[PDB]
């Protein structure tokens, strides 16, 4: 990019206008029949006049079309704004979801860049997890979004690795049990345990009960900073490490190392720096949310090193990687 | 006219990253001689490693360039990020200027389009003017910024209208007197008085003293919501009306009508919703800041009506318009 005006490249009005449309579900109200500002507004519960000005800006962006007596219609693009779209982006943009709300934490980016600390707290006076831990509905939405990322990224991951060979896997921080689920459903004879906080663990359990996996699927509420269910064949750290700073990440890694002993493997499944799903933007998001960071195969090794582990493999999956570490 | 991906359209990381680069004067430190994250960060007072991550993202965006070993350079675009660049953009983005800080108020857009009220208060617990009133340095930056818009928008306005014919003009909300100054520096037998709040008025006065215009130019501190210096030839309302909602606008207008009388002429000089610079993004900004509105020649006319005035001309000069109203 960068071919657009510097002021345009720095524009906030548009990205904010798009996010607001997503939150009012304007695209849904248009397809559902309400095609004029007065209607969409009363339908979404917005200020009729102000809402019109928003739309006008959005027809200009190329998300909506307006004509004659001000009848709005989604464009080939605006289509992606409705909840029932394949992509399922509206939920990430909606300002009520964990991510849609948390991304507004970017307005405090300056803080992070000046102190190397998360900016989310500067905006919401608390850590992201603390926030999700005290808002069940918010935490619920995060579980939903992460569940969605499993699809977008881990397509066919069950096959790309020799899971069965593990016998029993602990999904450290595998909230909502989507990955473990997709893993067991694809490899019978294999059992697992999802370890996460009350919120996700409660959803993982609910999941296994319905998919009829409670026989091989176990849940255990707890922090991955404390001893983990020891002796498993494998310990997966899926989309966890990048959520933490270096110190924390090695702590998390050691716990896995310990529980794994000289008999198991520690599989970190993340978007290592270089993957088609790992950008500088994700890294910035990681920094602004918790002061985490995307890391390279190299940087992960430096960490594994400080935990008594050693990278022995790296198989690239669909958009991310499966870094396999064992004790050294 | 925006084909790039929805997620990219709603992106906040980049706009914020640019604004932070502006505020940290990153481009200036690079051209000055600090080409390394560690250097540029120490020269900017930022956190070395965090900044490196920001730069990396801005390199990716296309504003900077990096060689191995972390050396950075400005791209042809990165230039515009310099504080001495022709455009003079950096200061509008800087989070310390009235606008660079006020735009972060967009993060509360949802509130405005939801209620019709301004959003700036939501984020700063006060109005824009209240803020500038209690922060003289802030107000100072706003004065210089608007001064900059004079050059960008009003280029040649001197001749575009028969000023000298008015004898004496009162620039209602004249700011630091940049406009009035230009008009007098072009019409030797023309006198005028700038009306504004303490902050701008004294900057206007300081100007007239350094440019020997104190003889034909004077300032008067006061709210344009109370009686104005009466009997002038013309009353100019430059970039004022769109900073206000309709009711407040007719208020300000009635005052001008009154002051002018059956013998004066009220001149609204602002980018009508019509064309050029005025846009939906501007209109959104006006709503976000004060519940203001960018209006059409009709919308203005409707307002003038309520103030006993009647549009009688509209010479489009440069990228904005000067609509001449008189008592009906
Ligand atoms: N201290 C802690 N102990 C255990 N789990 C934690 C934790 N802090 C955060 N988590 C969990 O770490 C997970 C990271 S988010 C996504 C992780 C999951 N493997 C996935 O990609 O879907 C979340 O489920 C979060 O609830
Ligand atoms: N109640 C009030 N009375 C007088 N001036 C006011 C005011 N409220 C705001 N202003 C001034 O209105 C101006 C609007 S922005 C700058 C306008 C200037 N004519 C540039 O004339 O084009 C600012 O200078 C602001 O300080
Ligand atoms: O896209 C992902 O994989 C991803 C993973 C995460 O663990 C996140 C945690 C907090 C916020 C966003 C996250 C995120 O976007
Ligand atoms: O561009 C302009 O003419 C303009 C005029 C204004 O009165 C503003 C007031 C507050 C914030 C931005 C403003 C602005 O950008």
Task: Chart the SSEs and their pairings.
The structure is a homodimer of 328-residue chains.
Chain A: H1 6-9, H2 13-24, H3 26-31, H4 37-44, H5 48-61, E1 64-67, E2 71-74, H6 90-93, H7 98-102, H8 109-115, H9 120-124, H10 128-133, H11 136-153, E3 168-172, H12 178-184, E4 191-196, H13 198-210, E5 217-221, E6 234-238, H14 246-260, E7 265-270, H15 280-290, H16 297-305, E8 309-316, E9 321-327
Parallel strand pairs in A: 3-4, 3-6, 4-5, 6-7
Antiparallel strand pairs in A: 1-2, 7-9, 8-9
Helix pairs in contact in A: 2-5, 4-5
The complex binds S-adenosyl-L-homocysteine (2 copies) and 1,4-dihydroxy-2-naphthoic acid (2 copies).
One 1,4-dihydroxy-2-naphthoic acid binds next to helix 7 and helix 16 of chain B.
PDB class: transferase
Keywords: co-complex, Rossmann-like fold, Methyltransferase, Transferase
Assembly: dimeric
Structure description:
Two copies of one chain form a homodimer. Chain A has 328 residues and is an alpha/beta fold. Chain A has three domains: 1-95, Orthogonal Bundle (Arc Repressor Mutant, subunit A), CATH 1.10.10.10; 96-146 and 272-291, Helix Hairpins (Orthogonal Bundle); 147-271 and 292-328, 3-Layer(aba) Sandwich (Rossmann fold). Chain A has 16 helices and nine strands. In chain A, the strands form two sheets. In chain A, strands 5-4-3-6-7-9-8 form a seven-stranded mixed sheet, sandwiched between helices. Chain A has a two-stranded antiparallel sheet with strand order 1-2. In chain A, helix 13 (198-210) links the parallel strand 4 (191-196) and strand 5. At the A-B interface, helix 1, helix 2, helix 5, helix 8 and helix 15 of A face helix 1, helix 2, helix 5, helix 8 and helix 16 of B. Bound molecules: S-adenosyl-L-homocysteine (2 copies) and 1,4-dihydroxy-2-naphthoic acid (2 copies). One S-adenosyl-L-homocysteine binds at residues 129, 146, 150, 173-175, 179, 196-197, 200, 223-225, 238-240, 243 of chain A. Chains A, B: Substrate binds at residues 7, 243. Chains A, B: Its EC number is 2.1.1.303.
């Amino acid at each position: 990019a960068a071919h657009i005006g510097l002021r345009a490249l720095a524009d906030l009005a548009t990205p904010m206008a798009v996010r607001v449309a997503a939150t009012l579900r304007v695209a849904d109200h248009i397809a559902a029949g309400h095609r004029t500002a007065a209607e969409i507004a009363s339908a979404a519960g917005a200020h009729a006049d102000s809402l019109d000005r928003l739309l006008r800006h959005l027809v200009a962006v190329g998300l909506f079309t307006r004509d004659g007596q001000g009848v709005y219609g989604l464009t080939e693009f605006g289509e992606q704004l409705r909840d029932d779209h394949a992509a399922g982006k509206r939920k990430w943009l909606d300002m009520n979801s964990a991510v849609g709300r948390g991304d507004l934490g970017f307005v405090e980016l300056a803080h992070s860049i000046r102190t190397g600390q998360p900016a989310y707290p500067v905006r919401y006076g608390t850590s992201f997890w603390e926030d999700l831990g005290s808002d069940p509905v918010l935490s619920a939405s995060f579980d939903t979004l992460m569940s969605h990322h499993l699809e977008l990224d881990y397509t066919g991951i069950a096959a790309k690795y020799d899971w069965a060979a593990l016998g029993h896997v602990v999904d450290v921080g595998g909230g909502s049990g989507g990955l473990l689920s997709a893993l067991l459903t694809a490899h019978e004879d294999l059992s697992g345990t999802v370890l996460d906080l009350q919120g996700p663990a409660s959803a993982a359990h609910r999941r296994f009960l319905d998919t009829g996996l409670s026989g091989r699927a176990q849940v255990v509420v707890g922090s991955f900073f404390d001893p983990l269910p020891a002796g498993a064949g494998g310990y997966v750290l899926s989309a966890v490490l990048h959520d933490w700073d270096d110190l924390s990440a090695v702590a998390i890694l050691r716990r896995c190392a310990e529980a794994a002993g000289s008999g198991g493997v520690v599989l970190v499944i993340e978007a290592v720096a270089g993957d088609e799903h790992a950008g500088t933007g994700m890294d910035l998001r990681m920094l602004t949310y918790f002061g985490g960071k995307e890391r390279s195969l190299a940087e992960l090794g430096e960490l594994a090193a400080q935990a008594g582990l050693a990278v022995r493999a790296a198989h690239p999956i669909s958009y991310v990687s499966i870094v396999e570490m064992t004790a050294l």
